Every structure is written in structure tokens, then in C-alpha cells.
């Protein structure tokens, strides 16, 4: 058990890393609250 449990936690950490990478690419896709742009643009 303490083995299978340890292996399960390691796999959870790898899957979390993968999800972080997909999330980072999605949020770097192109992302701009109108307030962050002075009337000059809008």
C-alpha cells in the first residue's frame, strides 16, 4: 500500500505539471481590461 500510494502521489504531481503547462499556453494564447488601455486606444 504505502508503495501504491506513493506512486499515486507522484502521478498526481506529474498530471498537475501537465495541466499547468496547458494552462500557461492557454493564458499566453493572447490574453486586456479596457481600464489598462487609456482612451488613446479606447
Amino acid at each position: 500500500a504505502e508503495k501504491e500510494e506513493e506512486r499515486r502521489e507522484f502521478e498526481a504531481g506529474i498530471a498537475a505539471e501537465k495541466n499547468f503547462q496547458d494552462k500557461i499556453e492557454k493564458i499566453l494564447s493572447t490574453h486586456v481590461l479596457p481600464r489598462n488601455i487609456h482612451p488613446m486606444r479606447r
Binding site: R35, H38, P39, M40, R42
Partner: protein, 434 residues
């Protein structure tokens, strides 16, 4: 909630302000007329709001002579300004400090204080005043000092930052320049609270050598000053990692109560067809600040010691890249600091890339103004002293002043006061031996 009243006295002040307001307008986004584009609290720092979308500024343009206010009232900014804030005289102060201070001051000073009072009534917390002028003619000097006395009477607990054009140290453009300049130095030592020096010839040289403009004009000379004033008083306009206040500039740059004459510099004065070739990183923009050919005053810092330097970073700047730059610059033995101040640096961070006016400067991602209170300004002070002594050896050009009404003793009082300034600068100059 935090705002400052901008006063421009004389052609110099009016024109610095011309550039000053054009820049402020652009930064915020306000259009010429005053109405905003088809649509924030930043407008509260310099403008107001009439409840109709016509931001009007907290500006008092005073000149004893027209055509310099009439250019403003005729040009494209006739509707940004309140049509009566632009106070116009009827007789030029005539490069006469004591005409602007003794005879033609009383036909206008009541109106000017009335408008300062009206602007300060619409103020929640007044962080201070910004007095823009020269150390030159009567409009720039005498009316300025006569204004400073009344604001010391009426606003004695209020901050008054000052931006002044020091006389050109080598050539100049008038012959009573040292007379007027030492008189306004004597009358603004005890009333002005932090007065930034700007020399013309330093702007001249930095425009010729860094801006790649072999034809610079006054439309550029204080177009740079508009940038540097905005970079000073923008930390209360935006947020930052290390936001700095107008009282923080004073409490971190004027160590003794009389030493309130810092010299400034701007960072990236790069020239559009020149910035495709540099990192413009924090370390090298700080090195470009401390390099002795980018100052605002023609004075060599190597003949003196730095006492307090405030760096104002605006743009995408990392405070620990600032840490690295300061750690690099404090190891060089050429830049000498005073020993009664083991750390003499202020850092200010603002998340705002600088606005660029259509013209000479290119925009950059990072820009710092470095405000240093150096002991090397005593060289310029003593050079102006030798200038005045050489002219005053035989009462040249004194008959105009004593005929209009200034007494003979005010010149000797100004001489003794600025010689005391010399002695104070030497006294903070030498090290501790006890």
C-alpha cells in the same frame, strides 16, 4: 485626492508649461479641447472635472507681457485652459528683477493670489505647488520671488517644488542675467523648498550628442523638461512597487534646510534611428544617468561629492534589476559619495512607459530620472559670483534699478547670502574629522 497646482511665471515658465501640459494631456488621454475620446482617476492629479467632460487644469500662467499668453489663447489649446486663468499684464518687466518685484507687481499680484486661492479652494489634499520659471529677466525672476513671498505667507505649511532655468554659464542671452539671478537666488533660498536646476547648454549638448539633432530648438529644449517633470510627478498619478510622494522627494533629498538645489538627468534620450541597437536595460540606463555628459547643468560632478540621489524608474522595470544596477554603481570609485551618508539612494518604481510626443524622442520601455543633490553646483554658483563681481565693480546697470526703486543695499544682501551659500556648500563638502 493627491494633486499639485502648476504655476508658470514668465515666458520661460509659460513655455515649459506649454510643453508640460501638452505632455500631461497626451499621457492621461485628454484631447486638446479638453473633452476625452469616445470613452480612471489620474486626471485628478493635474486636472479637474466640470461634470461635463471638460477637464480643466490647475494652471496659473502669469506674465507681465502679452503675445506669449496670446499665443496660447490663439493656438490649439484655447479651450483646454480656462480663458481667465491665463493672466496677462500690460507692460513687460524689462529684464528688471525689481520692476517685476517693486513697481509692476502690484497691478497683477492680487489677481494671481486670488486665482491661487480659487484653485486651492477646489483641492482635497494639496500636495504642493510646481513653480516653473527662469533665473533670467524680470518676469521670470522678480514676479516669481514676489509670488514666493506671498505663498510663504498664505501657504506656509504647503510644499512648493520649483523648476528653474539657471543662466547659461558660458554664453547667456542678456547682460543683467547675474544681477537678476543672484537677486532671485537670495529671495528664493529661504522660500523655495526644492528647486531643480536646468541649464540650457547641457540640454544643448545632450541634444547634439545623444538625440542626433544638429538643429535643436526651444520646441525641444523644454520638450525634454516636460518629460522630466512628468517623470517626477507621475508616482502620485499611477501606482508602483515603490511609489514616492512629493514630500518624500524633499525628506530624502534636502539634508540641510538650505541645501535644496538638485540637478537632474533623464534616461534614454535615444534618437529613434538609434535604439535598434541597445538593451536599454536598467543597469545601462542608470550608467547613462551617472555618466557626466547627460546632466541638466553644465557642471562636472567629479569636482564634488554626491549627497542624495533619487532614481525615478517608470515603465516595465524590475526593482531587483535596480538592486543590481545600484550594487554595480556603488563599487565604481569615480562616482564619489559623502561619508556622512553610507546609503544615499532612493528608488521609485512606476508601471508606466513614457508617452512620446510626435517629434525627436523615441519611446522606451524603461526610463529613469536621476535627481542628485551634488556639491558640484557650487562651481556654477561661484562662476556666477565672479560674473556679478566683475559687472558690479563699478555700478554698471545699477542706475535702472535704483531709478525704478530698488535700494543699493539689496545687492550687498544678495552677495552676502549667496556667499553664505558658498560657505554652506564647502561646509557640507569636507569630511568628518571629529
Amino acid at each position: 485626492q493627491r494633486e499639485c497646482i502648476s504655476v508658470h511665471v514668465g515666458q520661460a515658465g509659460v513655455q515649459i508649461g506649454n510643453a508640460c501640459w501638452e505632455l500631461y494631456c497626451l499621457e492621461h488621454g485628454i484631447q486638446p479641447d479638453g473633452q476625452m475620446p469616445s470613452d480612471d482617476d489620474s486626471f485628478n492629479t493635474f486636472f479637474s472635472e466640470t461634470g461635463a467632460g471638460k477637464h480643466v487644469p490647475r494652471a496659473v500662467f502669469v506674465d507681465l507681457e502679452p503675445t506669449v499668453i496670446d499665443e496660447v489663447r490663439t493656438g490649439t489649446y484655447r479651450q483646454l485652459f480656462h480663458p481667465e486663468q491665463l493672466i496677462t499684464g500690460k507692460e513687460d518687466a524689462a529684464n528688471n528683477y525689481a520692476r517685476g518685484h517693486y513697481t509692476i507687481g502690484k497691478e497683477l499680484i492680487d489677481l494671481v493670489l486670488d486665482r491661487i486661492r480659487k484653485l486651492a479652494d477646489q483641492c482635497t489634499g494639496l500636495q504642493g505647488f510646481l513653480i516653473f520659471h527662469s533665473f533670467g529677466g524680470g518676469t521670470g525672476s522678480g514676479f516669481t520671488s514676489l509670488l514666493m513671498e506671498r505663498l510663504s505667507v498664505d501657504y506656509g505649511k504647503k510644499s512648493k517644488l520649483e523648476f528653474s532655468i539657471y543662466p547659461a554659464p558660458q554664453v547667456s542671452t542678456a547682460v543683467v542675467e547675474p544681477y537678476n539671478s543672484i537677486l532671485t537666488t537670495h529671495t528664493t533660498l529661504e522660500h523655495s523648498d526644492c528647486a531643480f536646476m536646468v541649464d540650457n547648454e547641457a540640454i544643448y549638448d545632450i541634444c547634439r550628442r545623444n538625440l542626433d539633432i544638429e538643429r535643436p530648438t526651444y520646441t525641444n529644449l523644454n520638450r525634454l523638461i516636460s518629460q522630466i517633470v512628468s517623470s517626477i510627478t507621475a508616482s502620485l498619478r499611477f501606482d508602483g512597487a515603490l511609489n514616492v510622494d512629493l514630500t518624500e522627494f524633499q525628506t530624502n533629498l534636502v539634508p540641510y534646510p538650505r541645501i535644496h538645489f538638485p540637478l537632474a538627468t533623464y534616461a534614454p534620450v535615444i534618437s529613434a534611428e538609434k535604439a535598434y541597437h541597445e538593451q536599454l536595460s536598467v543597469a545601462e540606463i542608470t550608467n547613462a544617468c551617472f555618466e557626466p555628459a547627460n546632466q541638466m547643468v553644465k557642471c562636472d560632478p567629479r569636482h564634488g561629492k554626491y549627497m542624495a540621489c533619487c532614481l525615478l524608474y517608470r515603465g516595465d522595470v524590475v526593482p531587483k534589476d535596480v538592486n543590481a544596477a545600484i550594487a554595480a554603481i556603488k563599487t565604481k570609485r569615480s562616482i564619489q559619495f559623502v561619508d556622512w551618508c553610507p546609503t544615499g539612494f532612493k528608488v521609485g518604481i512606476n508601471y508606466q512607459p513614457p508617452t512620446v510626443v510626435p517629434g525627436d524622442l523615441a519611446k522606451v520601455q524603461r526610463a529613469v530620472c536621476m535627481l542628485s543633490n551634488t556639491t558640484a553646483i557650487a562651481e556654477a554658483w561661484a562662476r556666477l559670483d565672479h560674473k556679478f563681481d566683475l559687472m558690479y565693480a563699478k555700478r554698471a546697470f545699477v542706475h535702472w534699478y535704483v531709478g525704478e526703486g530698488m535700494e543699493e543695499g539689496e545687492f550687498s544682501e544678495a552677495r552676502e547670502d549667496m556667499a553664505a551659500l558658498e560657505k554652506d556648500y564647502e561646509e557640507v563638502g569636507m569630511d568628518s574629522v571629529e
